[PDB]
Design a protein around this ligand. Structure first.
Ligand SMILES: CCCCCCCCCCCCCCCCCC(=O)OC[C@H](CO[C@@H]1O[C@H](CO[C@H]2O[C@H](CO)[C@H](O)[C@H](O)[C@H]2O)[C@H](O)[C@H](O)[C@H]1O)OC(=O)CCCCCCCCCCCCCCCCC
Ligand code: CLA
Ligand code: CLA
Ligand code: CLA
Ligand SMILES: CCCCCCCCCCCCCCCCCC(=O)OC[C@H](CO[C@@H]1O[C@H](CO)[C@H](O)[C@H](O)[C@H]1O)OC(=O)CCCCCCCCCCCCCCCCC
Ligand SMILES: CCCCCCCCCCCCCCCC(=O)OC[C@H](CO[C@@H]1O[C@H](CS(=O)(=O)O)[C@@H](O)[C@H](O)[C@H]1O)OC(=O)CCCCCCCCCCCCCCC
Ligand SMILES: CCCCCCCCCCCCCCCC(=O)OC[C@H](COP(=O)(O)OC[C@@H](O)CO)OC(=O)CCCCCCCCCCCCCCC
Ligand SMILES: CCCCCCCCCCCCCCCC(=O)OC[C@H](COP(=O)(O)OC[C@@H](O)CO)OC(=O)CCCCCCCCCCCCCCC
Ligand SMILES: CC1=C(/C=C/C(C)=C/C=C/C(C)=C/C=C/C=C(C)/C=C/C=C(C)/C=C/C2=C(C)CCCC2(C)C)C(C)(C)CCC1
Ligand SMILES: CC1=C(/C=C/C(C)=C/C=C/C(C)=C/C=C/C=C(C)/C=C/C=C(C)/C=C/C2=C(C)CCCC2(C)C)C(C)(C)CCC1
Ligand SMILES: CC1=C(/C=C/C(C)=C\C=CC(/C)=C/C=C/C=C(C)/C=C\C=C(C)/C=C/C2=C(C)CCCC2(C)C)C(C)(C)CCC1
Ligand SMILES: CCCCCCCCCCCCO[C@@H]1O[C@H](CO)[C@@H](O[C@H]2O[C@H](CO)[C@@H](O)[C@H](O)[C@H]2O)[C@H](O)[C@H]1O
Ligand SMILES: [Ca+2]
Ligand SMILES: [Fe+2]
Lengths: 341, 78, 30, 120, 39, 39, 38, 35, 31, 32, 63, 503, 31
């Protein structure tokens, strides 16, 4: 037995936490990313990068702590602890936002490790690897949003911060500056996510309400056995119900479950494509025909133009605080605003 | 169905686990406590204390602006 | 005249719905 | 427009019921993807490599079309054994309950922000 | 040289449900993207 | 207690649950005192 | 030989010594101790 | 009966729980910082 | 409205071409 | 002062009360 | 299996189907070259990223 | 039969028809290149290489011809702005026609290989069915790649036998095609040094030749042959897709950030040059040198070429467009006619005011004027009842230096406000909006479109890689799992997951 | 040239629609 086979045997032992070869990448990187996030949200400020308190130590709460993006001055520097910025100084590395690339890169490699784990375990137990394929969607989201978007922009500063309110800020930023809601790729993402939730709810309810009477208890949960060969709910009854209620119904179980995979995954992939577009400011910001008409016709008003006005307001009022490195000085009189407000 | 390890319920219902942990768990708790309450965390992570966000000479946000010499920048920020 | 295009695509979707309901492939137990 | 004004006036993003709605829909999509992928992954071989695997299932067939035990083995090794459902009925109840509860909470969030009890 | 029948050729199929699904997908994609095509 | 040599698991659960409730109660109290309390 | 060059090379060396080959040593050692009995 | 005490599961448990309790102690202490 | 002069052709082809692809495949099915 | 001290005294006594009832019933053989 | 002149010319190139070297073969050397490639890619990335600054040039349009 | 998404799998085990479909795809791609170039030539406007260069006209393939040394037409014009040059056959038209003819020949070869699919070269002589020696094919193809890479670098790029490549000054004012010598030191890895590209092609071509020689002679280890399914062509598809999306990410990045292979005269400026005021600072430096001799303001600013000023204009940043703002940048602001000259804003008190430029992020931006020490001295107020710093109250006036408006001064606040709004966008230019019926909203450059397309394609090819790698490694269970699979998956029963020999 | 703005759509559909009619009929033939 060669040493490689012996190692392979040890890594793939049946234990409470499977390790595998993929574990060598997953567990250290995932632990680094998680511990980095926890450390930053507990102890680390964003005073020098954003002028914000972002840790429990500073008095922030769960909703307002974040591992904030690094200072815009560094561009897309990877900000290694040993890099030319921190130069091995851990305190300075924390202060310049070095924890953000730490978490982002370790999380990217952890995600790779987790999907490799899906592949490895699928191969070991002898099933098709569709779980890894489904997980490609979250990977596309993470790559586009946390890497490609800031890479197309001026710096990592404009990446989403790892935090609840940081993410909320990123969301509102994308609305105001990119008109992200108007983006058809985002609308396909929304369709996929809401459709996935709908499919989850409707399938769970349909199964639970077409169950066969296989026990005597009012508690129907123990009238199932994992090794039983027969279906536990009536597909025929479900199909008739949905055909008469909704007009159409699934008749193929396999197609049903592939659809439940397909819808949210495609939603994630389409939204990731849209985010890639936004990385280069290739926005679906305006409808030029309506802009031109409004510019020449002061009685043409649509919900689109109203939303454009909202975006202008958000940008002007938010930019000085959101982008402190720019030293934006917008005097009170240049701020757009409606009457009396 | 057990992969070999001792069941959690058995371990955490046993006297020896609790003899060990009625000590170990509180010690880490008060170790983190002391980490905060001695001011070690402030100095280790560079997080400002409530009275050090601004200095008697810097009333503005100490936003970093220089690409490579941040140690000196932070020092002049105080 | 882009109104015509919008109406056209919407009508296409609705016609697909009616045919998918009325002229569906019948589920058959076999 | 409705959503933007709503956020401006109520801070719905910082409302815990809307956070529960987001958990509802994100988690519902997550569980839809997992369930579909685990069932598709554990399909019993009934077709050839040419035809769609969907033809391996016949409408109204009594037998099970996938191996739930293999799906449980895979998932309980992906995370750990006791986090994996092996009872299809409990699994499907969870699939129904998660998005429904999340959406109930977010509906109540909007309904209570209707009375200007706003987000944090 | 001789022209010999290729034994790797296979029929393609699209069942009626697949047709309805594809037609709906095409119709809704057109609905979605037409406004942006017109701009 | 009811059995010698081991703690009942429900007692352990009650004790750990009360500890967790106290931790979350301390955090909610701190939302209103000290740093981050707006005062 | 710049300071950043020295730090990159040091990063290679310390990455090896801190992660790559205490982990390989530990994995090999344990796999050869706890060996699967066929 | 007579299981090993230390395992991969033991390490996985502690790798999380130990810093977790440390951090919780830190945050508890933060609850008493005054400006 | 001054819309893109390629909008009608783009939208119509965007719908039409996949439509005839599906129609061809469906109608020939069972041959 | 002492208000949190007394408050926590009453709160802890109340908290223990229910579990005390369950524990006493379980140990003494009562119906549960 | 129609024969052509160019087909016969090319025949020995497509004749070794499935022949392998038993065991691990040259895999260690492959691994060494892969590690060197990774270090090279790291070097050029960090140079492009300005996280590795060498003397003699600047990562700038001016050179 | 086959579902619609699996139709092409019929050439999976048919090497002759796989070659046929590859030939047809190659013919389609080459024909696209030729016809794209022909269309661009049919609409290209070559009259003004300064203010209407190729990248303002939505020219996508023309810069790629020009990058490698094809810079002249049969109509006498050259993209370097020169005329009367004789390129020979290898003009834009010649290259496009060559691609069309290549497309035809490839189409015919594809037809031949489709019809005569059953060549005995494809059949395993040991047994008798179709088989490809994939490792040996890799050795052959890699050796060829190394030869062609080395030849490209050492002969074309060096000018030993070939045109060289496009090189330019750092400010994109004197771009042209010349031989480039390789740089063998560390500077060869500076992405903005073309000698690095030359030395890369020589060295990597040599390495590819050596590696192909190795792969023509040494057979795969049995371990690797089994692990990577080297008898399965889908493993090649998987790893090829991986390498391809790697390359696509790289080319997208080098296009977005700029480098020696993406010069601004061919693809336009980058967003980062606008971000950092690269051209603005160079312009100011030239003006300051002129002044330091003793030139007046008007003379010093008149020394500034219109091309550099045109680079210093936000409408030429690739980060200003829209996903559905289609076509050439000339369809946006119009065709640039001339530089208006540099405005200098003075308020009533003589303070010199700087208009804050619009960042790449902002679709709209407030007009703000600051003095030397960064204090707002004038603006354009939104609300006027509490206005304090308006152009009207502060008496801001603008005088122009160089360009069309040289020597003129404006005091009418309407004109001052108009020119302040122009100054927000950088250097000001007169535009022909009639020719394109330009709409007034910015477009992105070919740099932006290329980066977008290739970033998206790379992202999708990641999924392609995952799909085909999974199909390669899980080929045995593609049609479903074994109708047994009972106790192999159960927990704790075996010592190693799946390994039936363990417990 | 100022040509009819419906020329492209008219010509393209004039060719396309009968083309797909013929294609459908031919491809399904023998079903
Ligand atoms: C599938 C996914 C599977 C999962 C994978 C997870 C693992 C990922 C590991 C990869 C890590 C990537 C790090 C990216 C570093 C980077 O890019 O960092 C950026 C650097 C370039 O540096 C940038 O350069 C810009 C332009 O500078 C140039 O121009 C300036 C203005 O004129 C100056 O003149 C300056 O001197 C001159 O260099 C600015 O200066 C920025 O501030 C600066 O950060 O590129 C570089 O290092 C290298 C550039 C070439 C390679 C790029 C590959 C990544 C491409 C991403 C897409 C790019 C664009 C499309 C966006 C969408
Ligand atoms: C002799 C044949 C020939 C010649 C001289 C040309 C010449 C040209 N072509 Mg063309 N082409 C050809 C055949 C040819 N082509 C064929 C057969 C096709 C069909 C696939 C095309 C399709 C095509 C398109 C779509 C385009 C061109 C374009 C061009 C022009 C610019 C090319 C360029 O940028 O290079 C770019 C090439 C590369 C960057 C090669 C990348 C290869 C990667 C990096 C290597 C892969 C990894 C490697 C194998 C592994 C490592 C090995 C290593 C160690 C050695 C140029 C005039 C462009 C143009 O200007 O349009 C008119 C254009 O867009 N061609
Ligand atoms: C990556 C390849 C590439 C790139 C970077 C470019 C770039 C460019 N081209 Mg071009 N072109 C290409 C390939 C490319 N082209 C090909 C293959 C053709 C043959 C059709 C053409 C033919 C062509 C013409 C005729 C013209 C250009 C022009 C241009 C310029 C204007 C760009 C523009 O507005 O497009 C706009 C892009 C969009 C509006 C984005 C469309 C996004 C679609 C709708 C996505 C589809 C969604 C999908 C259905 C979702 C799936 C659903 C899901 C369930 C899977 C620009 C520099 C113009 C120019 O100025 O020439 C001088 C012009 O006249 N090109
Ligand atoms: C070199 C690249 C490459 C090659 C040679 C293949 C080859 C193959 N793929 Mg694959 N794939 C790729 C990349 C590639 N893929 C990428 C990047 C993705 C992620 C999007 C995928 C995702 C994928 C899936 C999910 C599947 C395949 C399948 C297949 C097999 C059947 C293909 C078929 O009949 O569909 C026929 C396609 C049609 C009839 C219509 C397609 C219409 C598309 C959506 C629009 C076309 C746009 C335009 C014309 C394409 C040019 C764009 C170009 C610049 C890329 C075949 C061997 C199938 C398989 O595995 O079979 C068992 C399968 O299920 N692929
Ligand atoms: C049968 C075959 C034909 C099939 C056709 C399918 C058609 C679909 C509908 C059209 C879709 C595109 C229309 C865009 C709107 C338009 O009118 O453009 C019209 C534009 C031309 O635009 C015109 O250009 C002129 C100058 O030449 C002027 O500037 C005009 O003002 C301008 O309108 O045509 C194109 O741009 C085609 C090229 C598009 C490729 C660039 C993007 C590359 C990257 C794409 C990444 C996509 C990823 C998707 C992933 C998922
Ligand atoms: C934090 C995460 C860290 C992850 C750590 C992962 C643990 C290590 C996994 C290593 C797996 C890769 C090697 C696979 C085994 C193998 O190839 O053959 C095993 C061989 C065959 O030997 C002998 O050969 C005999 C004959 S033969 O192999 O059949 O030829 C055979 O019988 C016998 O079994 C065998 O002993 O044994 C070896 O000793 C060769 C080791 C070479 C390994 C590659 C080295 C590359 C890594 C170094 C990186 C730095 C390089 C310098 C850069 C500046
Ligand atoms: C009150 C009752 C009256 C009904 C009115 C509402 C109509 C809803 C009927 C759904 C139409 C079917 C479309 C799929 C075409 C069709 O007939 O599919 C039929 C299909 C049946 O699948 P099977 O199980 O038979 O599939 C087995 C294999 O043949 C797979 O091809 O149902 C589904 O696939 C469910 C998933 C799609 C669900 C799509 C719903 C979309 C909602 C409508 C969105 C468009 C609105 C646009 C407005 C402008
Ligand atoms: C390896 C890559 C695969 C391509 C093989 C290319 C080999 C060509 C070698 C020519 C360089 C040698 C060289 O520099 O020639 C110089 C000569 C003209 O060069 P110029 O005078 O313009 O340039 C100055 C030269 O005198 C110095 O080289 O070019 C030729 O006559 C071509 C000679 C062979 C023509 C190709 C050979 C047959 C084709 C195969
Ligand atoms: C940073 C860094 C690092 C790392 C580190 C680490 C990795 C660590 C860690 C760490 C950790 C890992 C920590 C932790 C934690 C934790 C916490 C802080 C917790 C919590 C919690 C809570 C609060 C919960 C609560 C609850 C709920 C809510 C539900 C039910 C009940 C309970 C109680 C459970 C190093 C040094 C390498 C390098 C440098 C950088
Ligand atoms: C036969 C022959 C010939 C001829 C040839 C020719 C004439 C050709 C051509 C060709 C061509 C002329 C071509 C082409 C092409 C094109 C293509 C291939 C394309 C495309 C497309 C696509 C794919 C696109 C897509 C899209 C869309 C649609 C939208 C946007 C996005 C995208 C881009 C995706 C000769 C006599 C010479 C020789 C003999 C033989
Ligand atoms: C859920 C859960 C858990 C936990 C639990 C806990 C943690 C707790 C609890 C509980 C408690 C901790 C309780 C309690 C109670 C108490 C009560 C219910 C009482 C009372 C009474 C009263 C009514 C009072 C009265 C009074 C007045 C009125 C005034 C005078 C004095 C006095 C104070 C006597 C376990 C793990 C087990 C299981 C699973 C989950
Ligand atoms: C999977 C791989 C993971 C890679 C990451 C793993 C952790 C890697 C951490 C590497 C840290 C590099 O840390 C770096 O160490 C070197 C060498 O001591 C320090 O260098 C220090 O000592 C050396 C000599 O002793 C002096 O020449 C130098 O001037 C001084 O700074 C750097 O200041 C520090 O930045
Ligand atoms: Ca007033
Ligand atoms: Fe199900």
């Amino acid at each position: 037995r060669g040493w490689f086979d012996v190692l392979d045997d040890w890594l793939k032992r049946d234990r409470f936490v499977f390790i595998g070869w993929s574990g060598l990448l997953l567990f250290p990187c995932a632990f680094m990313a998680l511990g980095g996030w926890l450390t930053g949200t507990t102890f680390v400020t964003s005073w020098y990068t954003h002028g914000l308190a972002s840790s429990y130590l500073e008095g922030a709460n769960f909703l307002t702590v974040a591992v904030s993006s690094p200072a815009d001055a560094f561009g897309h520097s990877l900000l290694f602890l040993w890099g030319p910025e921190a130069q091995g100084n851990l305190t300075r590395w924390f202060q310049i936002g070095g924890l953000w690339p730490f978490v982002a890169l370790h999380g990217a490699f952890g995600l790779i490790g987790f999907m490799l784990r899906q592949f490895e375990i699928s191969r070991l137990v002898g099933i098709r690897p569709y779980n890894a394929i489904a997980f490609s969607g979250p990977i596309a989201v993470f790559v586009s949003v946390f890497l490609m978007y800031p890479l197309g922009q001026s710096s990592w500063f404009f990446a989403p911060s790892f935090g609840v309110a940081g993410i909320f800020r990123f969301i509102l930023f994308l609305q105001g500056f990119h008109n992200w809601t108007l983006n058809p790729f985002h609308m396909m993402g929304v369709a996929g996510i809401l459709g996935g939730a709908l499919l989850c709810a409707i399938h769970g309810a349909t199964v639970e309400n077409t169950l066969f009477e296989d026990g005597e208890d009012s508690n129907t949960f123990r009238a199932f056995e994992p090794t039983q060969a027969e279906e536990t709910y009536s597909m025929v009854t479900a199909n008739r119900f949905w055909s008469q209620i909704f007009g159409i119904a699934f008749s193929n179980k396999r197609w049903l479950h592939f659809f439940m995979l397909f819808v949210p995954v495609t939603g994630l992939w389409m939204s990731s494509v849209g985010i890639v577009g936004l990385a280069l400011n290739l926005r679906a910001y305006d409808f030029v025909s309506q802009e031109l008409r409004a510019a020449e016709d002061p009685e043409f008003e649509t919900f689109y133009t109203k939303n454009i006005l909202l975006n202008e307001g958000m940008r002007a009022w938010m930019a000085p605080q959101d982008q402190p490195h720019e030293n934006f000085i917008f005097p009170e009189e240049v701020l757009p605003r409606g009457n009396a407000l | 169905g057990t992969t070999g390890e001792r069941p959690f319920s058995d371990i955490v219902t046993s006297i020896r686990y609790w003899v060990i942990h009625s000590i170990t768990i509180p010690m880490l708790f008060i170790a983190g406590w002391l980490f905060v309450s001695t001011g070690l965390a402030y100095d280790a992570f560079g997080t400002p204390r409530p009275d050090e966000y601004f200095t008697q000479t810097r009333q503005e946000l100490p936003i970093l602006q220089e690409r490579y010499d941040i140690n000196q920048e932070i020092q002049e920020f105080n | 005249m882009e109104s015509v295009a919008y109406i056209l695509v919407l009508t296409m979707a609705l016609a697909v719905l009616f045919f998918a309901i009325a002229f569906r492939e019948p589920p058959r137990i076999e | 427009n409705f959503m933007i004004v709503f956020q401006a006036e109520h801070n719905i993003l910082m409302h815990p019921f809307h956070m529960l709605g987001v958990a509802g829909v994100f988690g519902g999509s997550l569980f839809s993807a997992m369930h579909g992928s685990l069932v598709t992954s554990s399909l019993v071989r009934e077709t050839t490599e040419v035809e769609s695997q969907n033809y391996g299932y016949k409408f109204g067939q009594e037998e099970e079309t996938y191996n739930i035990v293999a799906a449980h083995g895979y998932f309980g090794r992906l995370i750990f054994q006791y986090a994996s459902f092996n009872n299809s009925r409990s699994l499907h109840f969870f699939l129904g309950a998660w998005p429904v509860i999340g959406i109930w909470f977010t509906a109540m969030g909007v309904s209570t922000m209707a009375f200007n009890l706003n987000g944090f | 040289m001789d022209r010999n029948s290729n034994p790797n050729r296979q029929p393609v199929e699209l069942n009626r449900t697949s047709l309805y699904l594809g037609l709906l997908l095409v119709a809704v994609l057109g609905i979605l993207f037409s406004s942006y095509f017109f701009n | 207690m009811f059995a010698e040599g081991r703690i009942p698991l429900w007692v352990v659960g009650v004790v750990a649950g009360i500890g967790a409730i106290g931790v979350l109660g301390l955090f909610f109290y701190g939302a209103y005192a000290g740093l981050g309390s707006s005062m | 030989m710049t300071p950043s060059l020295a730090n990159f090379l040091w990063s290679l060396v310390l990455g090896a010594a801190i992660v790559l080959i205490p982990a390989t040593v530990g994995l090999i050692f344990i796999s050869q101790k706890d060996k699967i009995t066929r | 009966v007579t299981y090993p005490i230390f395992t991969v599961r033991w390490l996985a448990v502690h790798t999380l729980a130990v810093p977790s309790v440390f951090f919780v102690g830190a945050i508890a202490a933060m609850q008493f910082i005054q400006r | 409205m001054q819309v893109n002069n390629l909008g009608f052709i783009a939208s119509i082809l965007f719908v039409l071409v996949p439509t005839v692809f599906l129609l061809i495949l469906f109608i020939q099915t069972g041959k | 002062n002492l208000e949190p001290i007394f408050q926590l005294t009453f709160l802890g006594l109340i908290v223990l009360a229910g579990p005390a009832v369950v524990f006493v019933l379980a140990f003494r053989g009562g119906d549960l | 299996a129609q024969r052509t002149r160019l087909g016969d010319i090319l025949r020995p190139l497509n004749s070794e189907y499935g022949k392998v070297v038993p065991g691990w073969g040259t895999t260690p050397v492959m691994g060494v070259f892969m590690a060197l490639f990774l270090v090279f890619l790291l070097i050029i990335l960090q140079i492009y990223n300005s996280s590795l600054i060498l003397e003699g040039f600047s990562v700038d349009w001016a050179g | 039969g086959l579902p619609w998404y699996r139709v092409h799998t019929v050439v999976l085990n048919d090497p002759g028809r796989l070659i046929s479909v590859h030939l047809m795809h190659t013919a389609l791609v080459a024909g696209w290149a030729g016809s794209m170039a022909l269309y661009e030539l049919a609409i290209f406007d070559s009259s003004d290489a300064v203010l209407n260069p190729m990248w303002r006209q939505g020219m996508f393939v023309l810069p790629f011809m020009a990058r490698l040394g094809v810079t002249s037409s049969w109509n006498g014009w050259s993209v370097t702005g020169e005329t009367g040059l004789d390129p020979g056959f290898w003009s834009f038209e010649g290259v496009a026609a060559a691609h069309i003819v290549l497309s035809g020949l490839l189409f015919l070869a594809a037809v031949w290989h489709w019809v005569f699919w059953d060549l005995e070269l494809f059949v395993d002589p040991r047994t008798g069915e179709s088989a490809l020696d994939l490792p040996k094919m890799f050795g052959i193809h890699l050796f060829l790649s190394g030869l062609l890479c080395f030849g490209f670098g050492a002969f074309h790029l060096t000018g030993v036998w070939g045109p060289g490549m496009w090189v330019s000054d750092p400010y994109g004012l004197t771009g042209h095609v010349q031989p480039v010598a390789p740089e063998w030191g560390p500077a060869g890895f500076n992405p903005f040094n073309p000698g690095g590209v030359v030395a890369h092609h020589i060295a990597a071509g040599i390495v590819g030749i050596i590696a192909g020689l190795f792969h023509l002679t040494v057979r795969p280890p049995e371990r690797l042959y089994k692990a990577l399914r080297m008898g399965n062509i889908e493993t090649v598809l998987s790893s090829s897709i991986a390498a391809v999306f790697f390359a696509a990410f790289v080319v997208a990045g080098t296009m977005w950030y700029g480098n020696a292979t993406t010069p601004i005269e061919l693809f336009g400026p980058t967003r980062y040059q606008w971000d950092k005021g690269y051209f603005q600072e160079e312009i100011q430096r030239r003006v300051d040198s002129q002044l330091a001799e003793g030139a007046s303001l008007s003379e010093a600013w008149s020394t500034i070429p219109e091309k550099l000023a045109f680079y210093d204009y936000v409408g030429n940043s690739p980060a200003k467009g829209g996903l559905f703002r289609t076509g050439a940048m000339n369809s946006g602001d119009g065709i640039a006619q001339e530089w208006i000259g540099h405005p200098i804003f003075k308020d009533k008190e003589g303070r010199e005011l700087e208009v804050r430029r619009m960042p790449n992020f902002f679709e709209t931006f407030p007009v703000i004027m600051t003095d030397a020490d960064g204090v707002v001295r004038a603006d354009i107020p939104f609300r006027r009842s509490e206005s304090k710093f308006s152009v009207e109250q502060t008496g801001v006036t603008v005088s122009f230096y160089g360009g069309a408006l040289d020597g003129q001064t404006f005091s009418n606040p309407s004109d001052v406000k108009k020119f302040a709004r122009k100054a927000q966008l950088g250097e000001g230019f007169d535009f022909d909006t009639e020719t394109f019926n330009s709409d007034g909203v910015f477009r992105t450059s070919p740099r932006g479109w290329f980066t977008f397309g290739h970033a998206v394609f790379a992202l999708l090819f990641f999924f392609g890689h995952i799909w085909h790698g999974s199909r390669t490694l899980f080929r045995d269970v593609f049609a479903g799992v074994d109708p047994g699979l009972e106790e192999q998956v159960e927990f704790g029963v075996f010592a190693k997951v799946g390994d039936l020999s363990t417990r």
